[PDB]
Amino acid sequence: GSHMGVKERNRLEAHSSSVRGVAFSPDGQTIASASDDKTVKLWNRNGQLLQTLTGHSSSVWGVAFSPDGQTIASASDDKTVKLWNRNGQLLQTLTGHSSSVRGVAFSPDGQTIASASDDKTVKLWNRNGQLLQTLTGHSSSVWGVAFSPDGQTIASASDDKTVKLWNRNGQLLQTLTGHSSSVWGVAFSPDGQTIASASDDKTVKLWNRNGQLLQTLTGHSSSVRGVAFSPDGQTIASASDDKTVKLWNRNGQLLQTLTGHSSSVNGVAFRPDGQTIASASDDKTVKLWNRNGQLLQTLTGHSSSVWGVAFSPDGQTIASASDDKTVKLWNRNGQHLQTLTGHSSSVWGVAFSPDGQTIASASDDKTVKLWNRNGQLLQTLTGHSSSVRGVAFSPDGQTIASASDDKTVKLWNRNGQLLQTLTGHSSSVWGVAFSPDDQTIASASDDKTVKLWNRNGQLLQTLTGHSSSVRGVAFSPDGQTIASASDDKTVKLWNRNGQLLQTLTGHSSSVRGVAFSPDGQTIASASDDKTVKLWNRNGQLLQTLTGHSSSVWGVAFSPDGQTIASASSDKTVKLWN
């Protein structure tokens, strides 16, 4: 036989903590986001992840692109500024600030970089990366920094309630006084003639270079953390702790409010052609909007381990289930479609109905929940006495099976009425699957067995042979072969009489998940050893998918059999093809 090698194609992930800043490359093709998760991530125009910049040892507060878009700078709470290339390699680490670095900017010629710090200073560095100047003195921490379009003026925003304007020799040109509290952000208009400042006092102020106050933007109900001018200089965007972005004209009129973030908004940026807006939030997401107030896309991912994954029978949707208490729905292009919120503890399992319109989730909160594709909670299934570890839909789409630490499998209708309990396991049940025969169910248990049942509740067969917990189970497409995944480091293949047909050996730690391809020719297994392995039916290893940075807990095939999705405690789902 022949197995064509598959490769990693999409990464279903994003930041796992607050996003502090966003920036666009000069051509508008790339977005950089900076996070408390200690990383910067680079995204294409479709919101697909291109690269992660790893290396900072504390939260990243600012990010900027060079004028040609080939160098990224980042500013961190770790007291360093780092300069990177687009392959994610470190060019330079710049040290000298005595406290957190809160903001970073490149000069228009990109030969100079400016950094703003809690240490009350702004520092100017060359690309190589010698310190050129220290700008003193604000009387408190400096939170924002910007260059004028000609690069001859630097603006800094400070907790001392002022914005200061400086030349490149560190001479103070002007102080903008008037905010009644900390200034968190500053921006220049495109023509360099107007300065905007965002303040803890709930306002944005617009100034000229003489320090005269041209206009105050009032309407936010809390601190304004970020501000930006549109490329045409006619619109101002503001990002607020009130969870909104507001768009204004120069007369102070409110044009639009962008609602959708669920926590404070920290940063806002216009794409250089002015056709989209990006915002960064404490809700751990970046949101992309058009110039009409509509949400285009959310850059989001799980904030903790991903324990389960499922592919829709429609072939276009993937669901991931996470310790972060959410289920996320994604398309096959790696774009987020929807987040399902409401469980009060970890989600261990997820499944699609045969028509792809309903999602079921199994949770440590002891419930199964049913949802629609728009994210609406439709029903809670209550009855298990402990954590729910696995869930599946029948081929007819009207029965839901759940497996629990309470040693049972339960069968339910969509109104959450209990149709049947399957009792017989002597320990926790971690996996459950329906046969395509539309008659039988399989369960996998910590008691080291798989059990096969009729849907009327009768135990038909026990599969004995594993020497440790069994946590995954799957049927072949013809329903005649069962596969089980175990803590004993093997996958086993069985017939419906409980005869062992084959043992798949190779993983070097617990096997948490298994699935058969739709053509039944390929088996995939997910392991604590951080790999997915691909096998044929003779028990032969065909390929080892390496790429996850921690345990892999779940695997699923697309309906056409061409794509595999894997879920890991590295907080991501990967698509392979």
Side-chain angles (χ1 to χ4, degrees), residues 44-65:
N44 70 14
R45 266 191 201 193
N46 292 325
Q48 301 169 315
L49 183 63
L50 297 176
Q51 176 73 45
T52 306
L53 312 187
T54 58
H56 279 301
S57 58
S58 190
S59 48
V60 190
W61 283 76
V63 66
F65 283 96

Short mmCIF file of all heavy atoms in Angstrom, two decimals, residues 44-65:
data_model
loop_
_atom_site.label_atom_id
_atom_site.label_comp_id
_atom_site.label_asym_id
_atom_site.label_seq_id
_atom_site.Cartn_x
_atom_site.Cartn_y
_atom_site.Cartn_z
N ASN A 44 -2.03 36.65 8.95
CA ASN A 44 -2.28 37.17 7.60
C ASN A 44 -3.64 37.87 7.53
O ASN A 44 -4.31 37.99 8.55
CB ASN A 44 -2.12 36.08 6.52
CG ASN A 44 -3.22 35.03 6.55
OD1 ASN A 44 -4.26 35.21 7.20
ND2 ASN A 44 -3.01 33.92 5.85
N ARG A 45 -4.04 38.33 6.35
CA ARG A 45 -5.29 39.08 6.24
C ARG A 45 -6.57 38.26 6.48
O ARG A 45 -7.63 38.84 6.73
CB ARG A 45 -5.40 39.82 4.91
CG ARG A 45 -4.91 41.25 4.99
CD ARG A 45 -5.27 42.01 3.74
NE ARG A 45 -4.41 43.18 3.58
CZ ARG A 45 -4.64 44.18 2.71
NH1 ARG A 45 -5.71 44.14 1.92
NH2 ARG A 45 -3.79 45.20 2.64
N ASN A 46 -6.45 36.94 6.41
CA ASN A 46 -7.57 36.03 6.67
C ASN A 46 -7.66 35.58 8.12
O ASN A 46 -8.48 34.71 8.46
CB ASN A 46 -7.44 34.80 5.77
CG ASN A 46 -7.64 35.13 4.31
OD1 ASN A 46 -8.45 35.99 3.95
ND2 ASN A 46 -6.88 34.46 3.44
N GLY A 47 -6.82 36.16 8.97
CA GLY A 47 -6.79 35.82 10.38
C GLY A 47 -6.20 34.45 10.64
O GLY A 47 -6.47 33.83 11.66
N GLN A 48 -5.33 34.00 9.74
CA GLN A 48 -4.61 32.75 9.96
C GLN A 48 -3.26 32.98 10.63
O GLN A 48 -2.55 33.95 10.30
CB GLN A 48 -4.44 31.99 8.64
CG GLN A 48 -5.76 31.67 7.97
CD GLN A 48 -5.58 31.18 6.57
OE1 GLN A 48 -4.81 31.75 5.78
NE2 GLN A 48 -6.24 30.08 6.25
N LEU A 49 -2.90 32.11 11.56
CA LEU A 49 -1.63 32.29 12.29
C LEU A 49 -0.41 31.96 11.44
O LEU A 49 -0.29 30.85 10.88
CB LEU A 49 -1.61 31.45 13.55
CG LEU A 49 -0.36 31.60 14.43
CD1 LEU A 49 -0.26 33.06 14.95
CD2 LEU A 49 -0.45 30.61 15.61
N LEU A 50 0.50 32.93 11.32
CA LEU A 50 1.68 32.77 10.48
C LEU A 50 2.88 32.41 11.33
O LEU A 50 3.71 31.58 10.93
CB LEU A 50 2.00 34.07 9.73
CG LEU A 50 0.97 34.59 8.74
CD1 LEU A 50 1.43 35.92 8.19
CD2 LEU A 50 0.79 33.58 7.62
N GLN A 51 2.98 33.05 12.49
CA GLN A 51 4.20 32.86 13.29
C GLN A 51 4.00 33.27 14.73
O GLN A 51 3.32 34.27 14.99
CB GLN A 51 5.34 33.67 12.65
CG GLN A 51 6.67 33.67 13.41
CD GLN A 51 7.39 32.33 13.30
OE1 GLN A 51 7.48 31.75 12.21
NE2 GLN A 51 7.87 31.81 14.45
N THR A 52 4.60 32.54 15.67
CA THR A 52 4.65 33.00 17.06
C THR A 52 6.08 33.40 17.46
O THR A 52 7.04 32.67 17.22
CB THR A 52 4.10 31.94 18.01
OG1 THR A 52 2.78 31.55 17.57
CG2 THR A 52 4.00 32.47 19.42
N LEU A 53 6.22 34.60 18.03
CA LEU A 53 7.51 35.09 18.55
C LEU A 53 7.56 34.77 20.03
O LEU A 53 6.81 35.37 20.83
CB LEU A 53 7.65 36.60 18.34
CG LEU A 53 7.31 37.12 16.95
CD1 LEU A 53 7.65 38.62 16.79
CD2 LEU A 53 7.91 36.29 15.86
N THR A 54 8.41 33.80 20.38
CA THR A 54 8.56 33.34 21.76
C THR A 54 9.94 33.71 22.29
O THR A 54 10.94 33.57 21.59
CB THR A 54 8.42 31.81 21.87
OG1 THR A 54 9.41 31.19 21.04
CG2 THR A 54 7.06 31.37 21.39
N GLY A 55 10.00 34.12 23.54
CA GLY A 55 11.28 34.51 24.11
C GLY A 55 11.17 35.46 25.28
O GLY A 55 11.98 35.38 26.20
N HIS A 56 10.23 36.39 25.23
CA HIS A 56 10.03 37.26 26.39
C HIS A 56 9.66 36.44 27.62
O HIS A 56 9.04 35.36 27.52
CB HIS A 56 8.92 38.27 26.11
CG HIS A 56 9.37 39.45 25.32
ND1 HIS A 56 10.37 40.29 25.75
CD2 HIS A 56 8.98 39.91 24.11
CE1 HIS A 56 10.53 41.26 24.87
NE2 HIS A 56 9.71 41.04 23.85
N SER A 57 10.04 36.93 28.80
CA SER A 57 9.81 36.13 30.00
C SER A 57 8.72 36.74 30.87
O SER A 57 8.53 36.35 32.02
CB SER A 57 11.11 35.93 30.78
OG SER A 57 11.69 37.17 31.15
N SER A 58 8.03 37.74 30.35
CA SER A 58 6.86 38.24 31.02
C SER A 58 5.96 38.82 29.96
O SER A 58 6.25 38.72 28.76
CB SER A 58 7.23 39.28 32.10
OG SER A 58 6.13 39.61 32.91
N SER A 59 4.85 39.41 30.38
CA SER A 59 3.85 39.94 29.46
C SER A 59 4.42 40.92 28.44
O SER A 59 5.39 41.67 28.73
CB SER A 59 2.72 40.55 30.29
OG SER A 59 3.26 41.39 31.28
N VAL A 60 3.89 40.85 27.22
CA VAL A 60 4.28 41.78 26.15
C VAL A 60 3.23 42.88 25.97
O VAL A 60 2.05 42.61 25.70
CB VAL A 60 4.52 41.02 24.81
CG1 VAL A 60 5.18 41.98 23.77
CG2 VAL A 60 5.43 39.83 25.04
N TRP A 61 3.66 44.13 26.12
CA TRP A 61 2.76 45.28 26.21
C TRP A 61 2.70 46.11 24.96
O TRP A 61 1.73 46.83 24.75
CB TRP A 61 3.16 46.14 27.41
CG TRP A 61 2.70 45.50 28.65
CD1 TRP A 61 3.26 44.44 29.28
CD2 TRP A 61 1.53 45.85 29.40
NE1 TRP A 61 2.51 44.10 30.38
CE2 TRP A 61 1.45 44.96 30.49
CE3 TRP A 61 0.57 46.86 29.29
CZ2 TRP A 61 0.44 45.03 31.45
CZ3 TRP A 61 -0.44 46.92 30.23
CH2 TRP A 61 -0.50 46.01 31.29
N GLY A 62 3.72 46.02 24.10
CA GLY A 62 3.72 46.83 22.90
C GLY A 62 4.37 46.09 21.75
O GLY A 62 5.20 45.19 21.96
N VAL A 63 3.96 46.44 20.53
CA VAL A 63 4.53 45.81 19.34
C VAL A 63 4.52 46.81 18.19
O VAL A 63 3.63 47.66 18.11
CB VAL A 63 3.76 44.51 18.99
CG1 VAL A 63 2.32 44.83 18.57
CG2 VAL A 63 4.49 43.71 17.90
N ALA A 64 5.52 46.75 17.32
CA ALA A 64 5.54 47.67 16.18
C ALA A 64 6.20 47.00 15.00
O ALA A 64 7.02 46.11 15.18
CB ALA A 64 6.28 48.93 16.56
N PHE A 65 5.83 47.40 13.78
CA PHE A 65 6.56 46.98 12.59
C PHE A 65 7.52 48.08 12.12
O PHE A 65 7.19 49.28 12.18
CB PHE A 65 5.60 46.71 11.43
CG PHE A 65 4.86 45.41 11.53
CD1 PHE A 65 3.58 45.37 12.08
CD2 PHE A 65 5.42 44.23 11.05
CE1 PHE A 65 2.87 44.16 12.14
CE2 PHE A 65 4.73 43.00 11.12
CZ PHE A 65 3.46 42.96 11.67
#
